[PDB]
Amino acid sequence: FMKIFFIPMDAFGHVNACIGLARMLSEFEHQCIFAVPKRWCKPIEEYNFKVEIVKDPTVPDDQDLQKKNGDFVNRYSHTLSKTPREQFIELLIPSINRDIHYAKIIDGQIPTILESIDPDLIIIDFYVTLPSVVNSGKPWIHLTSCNPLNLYAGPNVPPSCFGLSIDTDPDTVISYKQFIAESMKDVKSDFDEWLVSKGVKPEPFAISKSSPYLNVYSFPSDLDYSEFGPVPDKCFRLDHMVRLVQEDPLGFDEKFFDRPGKKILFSLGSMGAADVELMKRLVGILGKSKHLFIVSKGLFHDKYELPENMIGAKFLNQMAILPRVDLVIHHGGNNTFVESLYFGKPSIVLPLFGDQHDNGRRAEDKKIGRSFRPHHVTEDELLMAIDELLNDKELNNRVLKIGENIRNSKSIDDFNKKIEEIIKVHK
């Protein structure tokens, strides 16, 4: 039994992965404590974990959980259709600047919470380094909740966030890595100054320090990047971090499931549906599909309507819906992607940005779904892909087998043994 201290970035994609892993570790009678802003306190307490509040005076205690990222996606909607290269400068770097802003707000509050809680182990799900964790003198694990391609970074291996593969021309890979290094210079220069001020040595190129203890990620064995070598050094693969139960209301009348017809979950994640004009175009196409859609309509749900073959709400109980659908249309977010495979569902992937491009490429390359650019996909492409995947028995059988493998995985038992050994070695 041990006290495990979880520090997630203040967004669904990080918090849900950490809740998933916390529930799995609670099974072994470990006590999991979360450091989050007040608005995230009751949502996490609904899973019966203890919360330590971090102050963020830039966000109200009672702000809607979807407001912070919804307003971001709304403000940057014009970048969501651009090439991965154009997105890097215009969207991903601005996105990382928001991660750095939050890291600077929480970092000064973590050392006192560590002294007061005295955890055995820290688990962080963050895209940038926390000096408070590096300098804690306690064992800490970095949790990757995004697609894991960046953990494989090195010679010959394509960089993440561009949908590239082992088959990409070396010239293109080299060009992308040079572009990323040039593009990140000023952000890294400013970030490193902050690290040095707190007595932390910067990384040569990254602004997120890999744990010298262990680095855990969430990706099915069947999908992992074995073509780029084994599980990377100091890394540990869990097949999934699915929270099996979700406390949220369904979000609409359950009687919808009594309507005859194949059921499709349409969800661009916790923030992507804040691109209202995109949601309107896609819903217009899906309105012509002779199936039934359940739609995660997002922060601006009140600004657009669904046609008669569809039901939707601001935010859905996605765990309750997934076992009742035949197909998922999503943005390639890593939680939604692994949740859909966990329940044996094929997927249509419509990547918006970042690691989603890699999950779109992975769905095509592993023949478990179809991927298109959401702002470009034609009515014919989208309607035909839906009928294709619903009717492809071989592909449905492959996705069922991946779900079986994910559910059969014992890797949580090995993970628990490794963390117990890590705590003993450093005592």
Ligand SMILES: O=c1ccn([C@@H]2O[C@H](COP(=O)(O)OP(=O)(O)O)[C@@H](O)[C@H]2O)c(=O)[nH]1
């Ligand atoms: O209506 C919704 C929309 C999203 N989610 C959850 O929000 C998380 C979104 O994380 P993901 O990595 O899929 O996408 P992100 O929103 O982080 O890009 C997933 O766990 C979903 O199950 C949900 O419960 N209901």
